[PDB]
A paper describes a structure:
Acetyl xylan esterases (AcXE) that target mono- or doubly acetylated Xylp are well characterized; however, the previously studied AcXE from Flavobacterium johnsoniae (FjoAcXE) was the first to remove the acetyl group from 2-O-MeGlcpA-3-O-acetyl-substituted Xylp units, yet structural characteristics of these enzymes remain unspecified. All homologs were confirmed to release acetate from 2-O-MeGlcpA-3-O-acetyl-substituted xylan, and the crystal structures point to key structural elements that might serve as defining features of this unclassified carbohydrate esterase family. Enzymes comprised two domains: N-terminal CBM domain and a C-terminal SGNH domain. In FjoAcXE and all studied homologs, the sequence motif around the catalytic serine is Gly-Asn-Ser-Ile (GNSI), which differs from other SGNH hydrolases.
Three crystal structures of AcXE from Prolixibacter bellariivorans (PbeAcXE) were also solved, including a native form (1.35 Å) and two complex structures, one with MeGlcpA-Xylp (to 1.26 Å) and another with acetate (1.13 Å). The sequence identity between the CspAcXE and PbeAcXE is 52.4%. Both comprise an N-terminal CBM-like domain consisting of three antiparallel β-sheets, and a C-terminal SGNH domain where the central β-sheet comprises five parallel β-strands flanked on both sides with α-helices. In both cases, the CBM-like and catalytic SGNH domains are tightly packed and connected through a loop of six to seven amino acids. The residues forming the CBM-like domains in PbeAcXE and CspAcXE are 1–175 and 1–176, respectively, whereas residues forming the SGNH domain in PbeAcXE and CspAcXE are 180–385 and 181–386, respectively. The first seven N-terminal residues of PbeAcXE and the first 10 residues of CspAcXE did not have electron density and so were not included in the final structures. The active site of PbeAcXE and CspAcXE is located at the C-terminal end of the central β-sheet of the SGNH domain, as is common for all α/β/α hydrolases. The Ser-Asp-His catalytic triad is formed by Ser188, Asp363, and His366 in PbeAcXE, and Ser189, Asp363, and His366 in CspAcXE. In PbeAcXE, the oxyanion hole that stabilized the oxyanion intermediate during catalysis is formed by the main chain amides of Ser188 and Gly228, and the amine side group of Asn265. The substrate-binding sites in PbeAcXE and CspAcXE are mainly shaped by five conserved loops, from which two belong to the CBM domain and three to the SGNH domain. As indicated by a structural similarity search against PDB using Dali, the structures of PbeAcXE and CspAcXE are most similar to structures of GDSL hydrolases of unknown specificity and some with esterase/lipase activity, i.e., TesA from E. coli and Pseudomonas aeruginosa.
Residue numbers in the entry: 9 to 386
The structure:
């Protein structure tokens, strides 16, 4: 057996507007909920301080089955350790991985991770677009019987980075690079129904693909080339994709924010060529590690705040390259799945959030339903 990722979230420097509310993380206890893909029996948990400039101390970390909301099944709670000890300090810019731990992890299990912090970094490493409520209490509230029913709610994740499990060679993971259309803006809070979540459900029910996990490395507002929110896709590619465990496929579905940021035709045409070059660079680097790469066509923007005629031209340039260049190992045509048959330059009205840019839950289900699962064999 060897490690295979079952859940991950892509880290960044948290912006002030997305910081934890009072009472803050220092000397407080934070309960967070994640939804895994594949199950297993022996796990490790990864925590990141990659974007913080001060050390961060976790006095204790516990894991348990979440019962919804902030509640847990207390008989399932276990403590993590880090070289035998319950407490660990992360160095500035670094991550830590727990000791391996036995836990009955079922497919699509909701896992509550409870961290009691000591001193923390005001530049926080986290993932603002969690689409999931986290719960904060002042003090050290690490007992499995602690009451969180009154905790301060925050719809962000902090510090947590991944869960991997030990599996046999038939087990593997898909890693997915994207923006908020992949991170799940428009999906239901606490409903774990981002399109990669909907893909995980389809894989788990298809007997042939039941041991294939899904690692959602979307970042809300992300760019491939420059600017945007969080580190660019090119900058984070090694950490967020190539260093994951057990990955045998990458889906690249990103670039709308690069196009959306352009002020004129000249700039938009340059971004289209830059995206194509960036796709080729990431395809090559993944291929050199034996990973197959599938390309997602960029979905419609007309009627959204991003629409301009010259931006639409760039989008079409990129999509024609995705569809026809042959450089991707296959094409996942999300544009074809999401576009209105009656007005192909706009999203299906009933499958979007009101902004004509982000799908809604139905749209994310349609997008996952358009993926041929035969792309993930062995």
């Amino acid at each position: 057996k060897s490690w295979v990722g079952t859940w991950a979230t892509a880290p960044q420097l948290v912006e002030p507007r997305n910081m934890p509310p009072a009472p803050g993380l220092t000397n407080s206890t934070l309960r967070q909920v994640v939804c895994v893909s594949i199950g297993g029996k022996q796990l490790q948990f990864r925590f990141s301080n990659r974007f913080s400039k001060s050390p961060v101390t976790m006095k204790t970390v516990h894991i348990a089955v979440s019962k919804g909301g902030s509640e847990i099944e207390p008989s399932t709670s276990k403590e993590l350790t880090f070289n035998g000890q319950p407490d660990v300090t992360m160095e500035p810019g670094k991550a830590v991985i727990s000791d391996p731990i036995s836990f009955n992890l079922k497919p699509r299990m909701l896992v509550a991770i409870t961290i009691s912090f000591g001193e923390t970094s005001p530049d926080v490493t986290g993932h603002p677009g969690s689409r999931t409520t986290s719960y904060l209490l002042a003090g050290d509230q690490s007992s499995p019987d602690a009451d969180f029913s009154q905790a301060v709610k925050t719809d962000h994740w902090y510090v947590i980075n991944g869960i991997d499990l030990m599996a046999q060679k038939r087990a593997a993971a898909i890693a997915i690079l994207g923006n908020s259309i992949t991170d799940g803006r428009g999906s239901g809070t606490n409903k774990q129904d981002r399109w990669p979540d909907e893909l995980a459900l389809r894989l788990l029910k298809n007997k042939r693909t039941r041991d294939i996990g899904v690692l959602n490395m979307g970042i809300g507002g992300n760019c491939v080339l420059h600017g945007g929110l969080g580190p660019t896709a090119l900058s984070r590619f090694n950490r967020d994709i190539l260093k994951q465990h057990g990955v045998r496929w990458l889906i690249i579905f990103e670039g709308v924010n690069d196009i959306g940021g352009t002020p004129d035709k000249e700039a938009a045409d340059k971004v289209a060529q830059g995206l194509i070059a960036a796709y080729d660079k990431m395809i090559d680097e993944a291929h050199a590690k034996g990973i197959k790469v599938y390309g997602g066509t960029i979905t419609p923007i007309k009627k959204s705040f991003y629409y301009k005629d010259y931006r639409e031209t760039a989008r079409q340039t990129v999509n024609k390259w995705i569809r026809t260049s042959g450089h991707f190992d296959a094409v996942i045509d999300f544009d074809k799945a999401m576009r209105n048959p009656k007005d192909t330059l706009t999203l299906r009205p009933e499958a979007q959030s009101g902004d004509y840019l982000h799908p809604n839950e139905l749209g994310y289900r349609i997008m996952a339903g358009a993926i041929d699962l035969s792309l993930f064999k062995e």
